Design a protein around this ligand. Sequence first.
Ligand code: CLA
Ligand code: CLA
Ligand code: CLA
Ligand code: CLA
Ligand SMILES: CC1=C(/C=C/C(C)=C/C=C/C(C)=C/C=C/C=C(C)/C=C/C=C(C)/C=C/C2=C(C)C[C@@H](O)CC2(C)C)C(C)(C)C[C@H](O)C1
Ligand SMILES: CC1=C(/C=C/C(C)=C/C=C/C(C)=C/C=C/C=C(C)/C=C/C=C(C)/C=C/C2=C(C)C[C@@H](O)CC2(C)C)C(C)(C)C[C@H](O)C1
Ligand SMILES: COC1=C(OC)C(=O)C(C/C=C(\C)CC/C=C(\C)CC/C=C(\C)CCC=C(C)C)=C(C)C1=O
Ligand code: SF4
Lengths: 52, 178, 161, 739, 178, 42
Amino acid sequence: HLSWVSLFLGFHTLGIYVHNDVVVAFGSPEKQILIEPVFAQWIQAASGKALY
Amino acid sequence: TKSLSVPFLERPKNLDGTAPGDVGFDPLYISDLLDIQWLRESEIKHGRICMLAAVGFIVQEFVHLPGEVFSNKVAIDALFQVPSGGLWQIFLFIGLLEFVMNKGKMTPLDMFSDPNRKPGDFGFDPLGLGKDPQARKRYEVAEIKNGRLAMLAVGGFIHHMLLTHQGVVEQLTHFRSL
Amino acid sequence: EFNNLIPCKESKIFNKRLESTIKKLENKLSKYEVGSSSYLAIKNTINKTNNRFHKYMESGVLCGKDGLPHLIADGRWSHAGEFVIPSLLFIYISGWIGWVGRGYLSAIKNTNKAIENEIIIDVPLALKFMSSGFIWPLSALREYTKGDLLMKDSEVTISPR
Amino acid sequence: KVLIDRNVVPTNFEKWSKPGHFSRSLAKGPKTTTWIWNLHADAHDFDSHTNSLEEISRKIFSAHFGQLAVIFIWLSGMYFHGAKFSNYVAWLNNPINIKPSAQVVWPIIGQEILNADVGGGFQGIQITSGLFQLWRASGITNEMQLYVTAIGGLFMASLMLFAGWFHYHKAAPKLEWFQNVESMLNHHLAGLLGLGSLGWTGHLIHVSLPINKLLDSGIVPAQIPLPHEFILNRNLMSELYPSFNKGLLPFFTLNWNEYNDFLTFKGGLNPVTGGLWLTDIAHHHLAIAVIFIIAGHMYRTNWSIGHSLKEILDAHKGPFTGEGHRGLFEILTTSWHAQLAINLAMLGSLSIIVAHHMYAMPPYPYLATDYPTQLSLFTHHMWIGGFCIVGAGAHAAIFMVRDYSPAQNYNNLLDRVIRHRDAIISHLNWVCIFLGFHSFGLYIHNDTMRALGRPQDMFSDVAIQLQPIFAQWIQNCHSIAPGNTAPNVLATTSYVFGGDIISVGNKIAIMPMSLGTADFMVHHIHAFTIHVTALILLKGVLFARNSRLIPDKANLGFRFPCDGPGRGGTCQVSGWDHVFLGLFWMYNSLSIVIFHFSWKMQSDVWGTISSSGDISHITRGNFAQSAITINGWLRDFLWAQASQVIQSYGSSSSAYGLMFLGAHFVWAFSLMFLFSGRGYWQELIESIVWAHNKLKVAPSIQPRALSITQGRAVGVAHYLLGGIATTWAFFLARIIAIG
Amino acid sequence: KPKWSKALPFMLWPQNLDGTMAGDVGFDPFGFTNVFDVKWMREAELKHCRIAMLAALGFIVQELWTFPYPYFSKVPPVLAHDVYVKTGGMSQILLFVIFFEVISLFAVSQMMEGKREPGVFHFDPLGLAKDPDTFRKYEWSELRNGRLAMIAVGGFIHQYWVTKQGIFEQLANFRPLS
Amino acid sequence: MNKDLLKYLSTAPVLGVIWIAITAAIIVEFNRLYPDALFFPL
Ligand code: CLA
Ligand code: CLA
Ligand code: CLA
Ligand code: CLA
Ligand SMILES: CC1=C(/C=C/C(C)=C/C=C/C(C)=C/C=C/C=C(C)/C=C/C=C(C)/C=C/C2=C(C)C[C@@H](O)CC2(C)C)C(C)(C)C[C@H](O)C1
Ligand SMILES: CC1=C(/C=C/C(C)=C/C=C/C(C)=C/C=C/C=C(C)/C=C/C=C(C)/C=C/C2=C(C)C[C@@H](O)CC2(C)C)C(C)(C)C[C@H](O)C1
Ligand SMILES: COC1=C(OC)C(=O)C(C/C=C(\C)CC/C=C(\C)CC/C=C(\C)CCC=C(C)C)=C(C)C1=O
Ligand code: SF4
């Protein structure tokens, strides 16, 4: 299971970074996959951060 | 040893001339790649859909249900005009039919698990048209030949509509060349 | 919520990106003769670029302060197309590949060519399994409840502990 | 004598579906994934398949036709891309202001950005192979000639593929045919090299000379007659070269001086193109052709005349060397590995000579001021040379393990070398330590002194000088040679030694290369890195069969991981493991050579000249003061010159930015293989296999970790690919921007 | 077999030409049939024969007549290639040639396995050679006419490139070269 | 079609390459005709 979770994180994290590099390299930063860290932002809000 | 329809090719081993519509036509030897029972079922099913679809294309040019949503005499354009919610009800009902008709055995692994199951035969003969064994044997071939013809026709009807954006009959009456 | 984000159609940074991208392409276009293959290539890039930016504008994807689309993947249905729907598509396809592959493996183990059929595929047999993948979720669920999915722990080899 | 066996091997696909048919060990089929790797690793190890030297020889001969077919397809592709997808004709018309391009990308996922603005209304990838300059020198003026050459290439490929099939399956020569080494040498000297050079002289005189003379005078390509016009109408030729009026009578009557208009000894460079004079190139090839045709009459074949190679070898023995060259003739006519070792060493060494000679005496028009091409050609040919040299070590070691016998080598040179291997390796060990300290140590001294604020204590041109006085003296000899020790030569072989600054456009083609302290230091680095690479490979060969540690090493073979953890630990004792280690040192060595070249040329050679005559070098002469510390290399070379590659995103050079990062990735990934061992991996696989067994999805071909040796092979292959491709991307992005 | 080649009296009869096939007068000086299979070569010979014959007649008829519509409209045969590539008429012919050639792939493989004779597709709708003796007679004619048409077509296309005249235009005038 | 040839076409690397090439082609062709799908449109 540790093997699985490591492979799962690895393939997809490296994959997204490489998607982003290729699409930015060819002059289209708007094609990037950009995920908002909404769970962490929600935890910040729970401690009183008003920004979000 | 040779195919009847393509006399310079060896007969495909799975085509024994017994099944209706069999004239040993399989020059690419697809019946060696895929299961012949599954292929036969698939052929009939494609045929039955296209027979209905062919009639559908014509009748929809003339007859309609009430409302402007069920107008449009071009069949391919009518698909995007009618309510999408209605298409979902058709789809899910077809799903139920596919499940019930096949008794939950829906794949090449299991569809012909019962020895009695034969391709295309769902035991549907309300009016008892195929009571006579000899007549039924003729009808089996007619069903497949008409299905085969309707498949090619519907292929035409669709590509003609994509090219012209006119109905089937509209195109014939007002025939415009390339 | 998402006060740090804005719809990309309301974003001034997102619009400026379009303008600056096109402005660069039109400078590149001016170096070539009208009608030339080079000229037409650059025109296609200009059209494709415009199409992309307008598509995102009409979608209701949110933009950051960088003026780039940011995707929301918390489960809310107003952003289902950004992650949930792609996810369902992936699971359906990947589960199919896995399920039909598992089915083929088991079929050849019940033969004398258990090893040969791994390096030289029995293609008819493979296509039969590949054709049967479309209801893998139900197949897998029934196999699980039948007790045919899993081996018992005592029937699998383990090392000393 | 022609000796052949007919209809030897049937032609059917039966064995194509029987993987590993060729080996007794592999024919039984897999039990384990190790078998899959073994199939590939052993496919071309023909002497492991059979003991028959005849059978081995036949496979080799046929495989060679296969290689030639592949080369013709590749060559054909280059010509076809020239004809169909290039700006060759536009470049032909305006070679100073158009960048060559012969690759165009399809518009998918935004990759059309890579179709760069190369000029001539064209968009495509800028090429650095030098094809356009080659084709110009050949006299090609239109796309039709490229198309036809491409088609001829496909015909040749098909002919090679037929010959390969024919000479294996239908008419396979007997061993006695292959061992005709005297006949082979006569034909390869006189026939292949001699007639090849003569044939090319024919092309040069009749096609290249006139067309290039007209191009250089400024005639528009489309207005130049086609090649056959010069052959049929001699007056067209005689207009350009008057001696053609006299025809062939001067040749047969030995009035050869009559042809001194098209057969010259000018030296230097054509001022218009910045390339060697084609009339010199014509004369070079004629002279070479004569020498080679004479050379190929040395050896005895079917008549009384000529030398026996065996007799020559057997006579050369003196008081220091026992039986001398006795027994070598038998080695070199019974061992393919022994032949491969020599031939790789020489072919590799030659590739390296080509790199140096082509930059300094640029043979093609508009090569010298195509900085991307100059940099690419030198670098490419250096790498090919390095890899071949390491291969020579591999095959020398394989020979020692598999083909050496004591009885054949009693008190001959080979026997006597292995009988003092400790003296050889100990001295080479010492010279490597000496060179390491007195080369790299000087850079460390300098870094330390400059960091401490003591520039006056440095080794530099402006402090403690280390002048390469011998190289400086040779430069001077070469600069004064014309009209002196070479009285009938008009100009220097190369302006690199001294003399004029040659410029084309306003770009410097070639000019004198000054040698100072920084040049002294980097030359001793090269001496160092080459001696260490030699140490590792030589040691592999001399200790391939045995050592004090492992007395029976030959029985373990060429390629084995170790002989266990005993005797202190014996990892990497095999001959193969010396090749493994030698590859890293070859990589290290050649990286510094190409870095020296890149920086020195940009700092001290390449650049622009004004009309007044003010040279502006690409990196403004920073080499002398920056190249004497490691910090200077890190900052003024790597950091400064990486600006192009690292800022390439969103431009036509973005592919190089991507390759640069990708290559860093592959390099780092290699370290997983090099630093770990399979015991760890096989255990990890056990747990993963448990999960598959649980879910009834374990394969019958059992998963294994890679072999110990394969781990090493995978590691070094990714290390080299990553390392070399990083430099490739770095170099191309930089030189295409500034050059 | 007759030992010495009939066509080349100074050369031996090719070793793998047995004398039995139609067209065989022992003409293979370069010895193609020493290495390549004669069945493969004959398969190829007849394909070239049949394509060339159609071509020869096509060149002739096209210059004497075309179908009475502007889409056709008289052009020189050689130029017509590029005309109908543009319209898509040439792609249509390619579509059905591909179809028949993909099928022929199986025919050729079965021939090399010895299950089919080279050039045989059992195509004789009108039944002009039901008798064996008339069939063998016609085998020779097919080869002879086919071999002639192969060269003839070479004439037509080359003479056009030189003269810039049709077949009959050139025979009307017949101007010599310079 | 020849059985030995068909057996060769069934080997892991040949089927591997053909199947990956078709899959790759499908993805290329989807992106050639429907470019820049960052998300499912709805
Ligand atoms: C950049 C360097 C690098 C990279 C990429 C890896 C990658 C990996 N290591 Mg390794 N490792 C490294 C350096 C690296 N390591 C070093 C220096 C050491 C010290 C010796 C180790 C020691 C080590 C140990 C001890 C272990 C790992 C494990 C892993 C895996 C972790 C999970 C993961 O990310 O899966 C995702 C997979 C990747 C990111 C691999 C690359 C995927 C590529 C990009 C796919 C390309 C496909 C594409 C079509 C191209 C094909 C090419 C063509 C020629 C065919 C992953 C395969 C662990 C493991 O196996 O867990 C299961 C594990 O236990 N590593
Ligand atoms: C049908 C094939 C199949 C199936 C159902 C599984 C299933 C699984 N694998 Mg395994 N795996 C496979 C092939 C398969 N694997 C192959 C060929 C390799 C060598 C690369 C592996 C290497 C591997 C590792 C290292 C790990 C798993 C793990 C797992 C488990 C978690 C999911 C995962 O991490 O996959 C990840 C696997 C990959 C990314 C490998 C690629 C899978 C290929 C594409 C499938 C090949 C399909 C096959 C050719 C289809 C032919 C069928 C046709 C003839 C009909 C799951 C039980 C993990 C685990 O143990 O979790 C508990 C884990 O750590 N697998
Ligand atoms: C045209 C049909 C043909 C057929 C049916 C045969 C059949 C045979 N050959 Mg023959 N042969 C042929 C042509 C043919 N050959 C040609 C053209 C040559 C000259 C190269 C030879 C030279 C030859 C030799 C030297 C040998 C054979 C052998 C054999 C036997 C085993 C073949 C095998 O299993 O490997 C199948 C292997 C392949 C399908 C791979 C071949 C790869 C080619 C050559 C190069 C590929 C290009 C390039 C590297 C691709 C790189 C891709 C990139 C990603 C890196 C079999 C009877 C062997 C034998 O043992 O007979 C007793 C043997 O030693 N053949
Ligand atoms: C089997 C079905 C079939 C179909 C549907 C087509 C369809 C077409 N062909 Mg193609 N063609 C075919 C087989 C077929 N062809 C075959 C077997 C060959 C021999 C290789 C060709 C060789 C060919 C050439 C050289 C050309 C075409 C062209 C065309 C296009 C003409 C457009 C037009 O304006 O029509 C106008 C139609 C009419 C005025 C009506 C004509 C009525 C006839 C009898 C056709 C009806 C046949 C019907 C499908 C089946 C039997 C009917 C029944 C009465 C017995 C059209 C797309 C042309 C093209 O590309 O145009 C741009 C063109 O130049 N075809
Ligand atoms: C919206 C609203 C309206 C309400 C709409 C309402 C009442 C109309 C509903 C129409 C329905 C009942 C039609 C039913 C659609 C029937 C379908 C098309 C049957 C599919 C058959 C398949 C294709 C079988 C194929 C196969 C067969 C051949 C063989 C098997 O083996 C396999 C399968 C694969 C099952 C109006 C009218 C009031 C107007 C107003 O303005 C707006
Ligand atoms: C044996 C024989 C002897 C004959 C020997 C002699 C040398 C025989 C040689 C004949 C050869 C040369 C025929 C060559 C045939 C040339 C082919 C058929 C050309 C194909 C052109 C294509 C088809 C055009 C495509 C075109 C192009 C390229 C491009 C497009 O744009 C347009 C089209 C239109 C498509 C004799 C004389 C002694 C008599 C004796 O009795 C026996
Ligand atoms: C000491 O160094 C090491 C080892 O031991 C010497 C190892 O063993 C491994 C582990 C690596 C292994 C086992 C090789 C990985 C091979 C692959 C990816 C499996 C091949 C699978 C297929 C061809 C099937 C997939 C099918 C398709 C995609 C079509 C590592 C990392 C290592 O550092
Ligand atoms: S560590 Fe590996 S290579 Fe070294 S002795 Fe042990 S098994 Fe052999």
